Design a protein around this ligand. Structure first.
Ligand SMILES: *[C]O[C@@]1(*)[C](S[C]2O[C]([C][O])[C]([O])[C]([O])[C]2[O])[C]([O])[C]([O])[C]([C][O])O1*
Ligand code: NAG
Ligand code: NAG
Ligand code: NAG
Length: 604
């Protein structure tokens, strides 16, 4: 008709649609696009009245505990219906931390955390995990995952070291294959730095957190990274360029500083480097209250937080709560000439560019036929393959002349499974699982190590579980062997920062009691290397299983010799925390186990 609106026409080029919509928008509509809010503060009126551009779920932000995929779809669609009811009908994009599967969601497949994936040296595996993750995210109606974390963790004292594929940038680079898994492969023609998402069965990705988040002093989370530009560019930056080449749709800025300059206020790096040198054309998003934390104390000059961040080049702000204040302050700054319209128009161009590119104007609503992708057995099979491939065998015999303990026989009259982490699904998933910090016990659908043992063994094999047996119990039990699992409790972000890296008790005391009685395979669950000499000294065999996720049969696949051990350390294992930071090229490089170490077995 003469009711045609070019931006609404799916046959037009993305840039023509962006320009056409931009040209129609009020300042309020523009600033609304730049605002991302928590679902916890969203209502239909809020979304409509403030022209909100995006919503998220922070860790543990769920419609309710145990919600079905359809409950999530219906929640997301309710918010979208409100956004579509605005004058311009701009759909919101909904983001979430799907960082090892769609991990906030009950019944979602939970993949190994990134450090384990590093150990696989299998970028195609990681791609396929991207692919599966996209499907389980879209099962829930969600279009945007805040992944991959391409931090290069340089000090394992950092509470997010498990979110880093490796201390070696080349491994992190190789695992940027998660991006085309989540988003789809970019076409032959593609210009590096353009955003890309294939369509409604894929999700927008997010390379995070730009830049040097894994380089902070003593691994303190959100702190300062002191390194010259050459080291920044040589360690922390390279994977951002691989992300551009694969069309990552968004980049999230780090809470960390670089030589004292807050990333969230760093115009030279965000605009000068990311946008102007790497030619990034997607949208730059803040971290959660990232702009607030520009100042000390945080939140003490919000006016300045908004100015500094938007002038630095950020496009979308993860507020995520005080949207009225954010919108009011940015409006005032624009009205006062402090922030030019050209900056607003750039941020909104980028946001709209991602939304049009990914098909969000053509498919703003969830597909109910996708709900059944959640926790699909094919995806669990993949997680089980990844878990097994992630495992790094550190010891398999106390002496060079002992019979190797692994692989264990599936037939034996009686076996012991022991330890705090042998039958605890939450602990084997770690942080960013159901809750932000993760949790203990049977928090979702999966298979614990105990469950996996019982599923694996010959029917004549009696399996005895004892969480923390004493030495006499073990000696008296008539056991052929034991599998004993211990390690770190779940943690996320600052809560995981840890200067001593010794596992909690009872962990070591149980290993000692078990292994003193019967030959034992110790399965160490951790997000990083931890003090391990005492555990090694006690154990016949020891496996670094990292945080292998929901599919504990990946552990038993290698214990019982269905597959051989192939994992190799993607990080240095230190002798002592007083050595840290210590990386695979220093000077005082005196590792317990060097990067790349890993014993192997053959399938039986
Ligand atoms: C769940 O947010 C936490 C933040 S951290 C922040 O969260 C965003 C969104 O979940 C992630 O994508 C990002 O990788 C991460 O750095 C803490 O710093 C907050 O203090 C906490 C308070 O509720 O929430
Ligand atoms: C502080 C100390 O002496 N030992 C601790 C442990 O109890 C603590 O929970 C952890 C977290 O940082 O670090 C180690
Ligand atoms: C680093 O942490 C110290 C100690 O908590 C804190 O006082 C300082 O502000 C932090 N620095 C940065 C840049 O975040
Ligand atoms: C495993 O296979 C390799 C190569 O074929 C061989 O050299 C090694 O001795 C094998 N180990 C065992 C226990 O069979």
């Amino acid at each position: 008709a003469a009711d045609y609106v070019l931006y609404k026409d799916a046959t037009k080029p993305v840039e023509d649609r962006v320009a056409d919509l931009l040209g129609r928008m009020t300042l309020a509509e523009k600033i609304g696009q730049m605002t991302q809010i928590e679902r916890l503060v969203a209502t239909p009126d809020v979304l409509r009245d403030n022209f909100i551009g995006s919503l998220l779920s922070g860790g543990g932000s769920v419609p309710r505990k145990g919600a079905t995929a359809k409950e999530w779809q219906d929640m997301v669609d309710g918010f979208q219906k409100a956004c579509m009811s605005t004058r311009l009908g701009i759909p919101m994009i909904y983001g979430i931390d799907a960082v090892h599967g769609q991990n906030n969601v009950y019944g979602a497949t939970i993949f190994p955390h990134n450090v384990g994936l590093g150990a696989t040296r299998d970028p195609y595996l990681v791609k396929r995990i991207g692919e599966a993750t996209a499907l389980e995210v879209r099962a829930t109606g969600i279009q945007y995952a805040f992944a991959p974390c391409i931090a290069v963790c340089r000090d394992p004292r950092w509470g997010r070291c498990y979110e880093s594929y490796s201390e070696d940038r080349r491994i992190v680079q190789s695992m940027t294959e998660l991006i085309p898994g989540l988003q789809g492969d970019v076409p032959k023609d593609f210009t590096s730095g353009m955003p890309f998402v294939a369509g409604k069965n894929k999700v927008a990705a997010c390379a995070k957190h730009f830049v040097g988040d894994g380089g902070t002093v003593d691994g303190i989370n959100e702190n300062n990274t002191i390194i010259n530009r050459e080291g920044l560019m040589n360690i922390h930056m390279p994977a951002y360029k691989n992300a551009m080449d694969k069309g990552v749709s968004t980049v999230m800025i780090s809470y960390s500083s670089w030589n004292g300059v807050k990333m969230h206020a760093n115009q030279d790096l965000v605009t000068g480097y990311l946008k102007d040198t790497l030619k990034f054309k997607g949208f730059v998003i803040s971290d959660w209250e990232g702009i607030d934390r520009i100042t000390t104390p945080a939140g003490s000059d919000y006016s300045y937080s908004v100015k500094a961040s938007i002038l630095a080049g950020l496009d979308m702000i993860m507020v995520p709560n005080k949207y009225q204040q954010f919108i009011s302050i940015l409006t005032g700054h624009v009205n006062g000439g402090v922030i030019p319209m050209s900056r607003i128009d750039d941020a909104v161009t980028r946001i709209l560019r991602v939304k049009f590119t990914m098909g969000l104007f053509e498919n703003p609503y969830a597909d109910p036929a996708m709900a059944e992708q959640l926790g699909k057995q094919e995806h669990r099979d993949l997680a089980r393959e990844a878990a097994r491939k992630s495992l790094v065998l550190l010891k398999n015999g106390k002496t060079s002349t002992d019979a190797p303990l692994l692989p264990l026989p599936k037939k034996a009259p009686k076996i012991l499974v022991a330890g705090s982490h042998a039958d605890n699904l939450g602990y084997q998933c770690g942080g960013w699982t159901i809750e932000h910090q993760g949790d203990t016990g049977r928090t979702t659908v999966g298979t614990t190590i105990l469950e996996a043992v019982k599923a694996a063994v010959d029917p004549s094999t009696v399996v005895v579980f004892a969480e923390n047996p004493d030495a006499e119990f073990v000696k008296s039990g008539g056991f052929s062997y034991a599998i004993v699992a211990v390690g770190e409790h779940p943690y996320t972000e600052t809560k995981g920062d840890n200067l001593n890296l010794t596992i909690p008790e009872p962990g070591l005391s149980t290993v000692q009691a078990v292994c003193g009685g019967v030959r034992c395979a110790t399965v160490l669950i951790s997000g990083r290397p931890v003090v391990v000499q005492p555990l090694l000294a006690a154990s016949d065999a020891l496996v670094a299983a990292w945080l292998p996720g929901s599919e504990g049969q990946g552990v038993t696949d290698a214990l019982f010799g269905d597959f051989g051990f192939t994992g190799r350390l993607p990080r240095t294992w230190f002798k002592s925390v007083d050595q840290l930071p210590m990386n695979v090229g220093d000077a005082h490089y005196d590792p317990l186990f060097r990067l790349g170490y890993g014993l192997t077995t053959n399938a039986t």
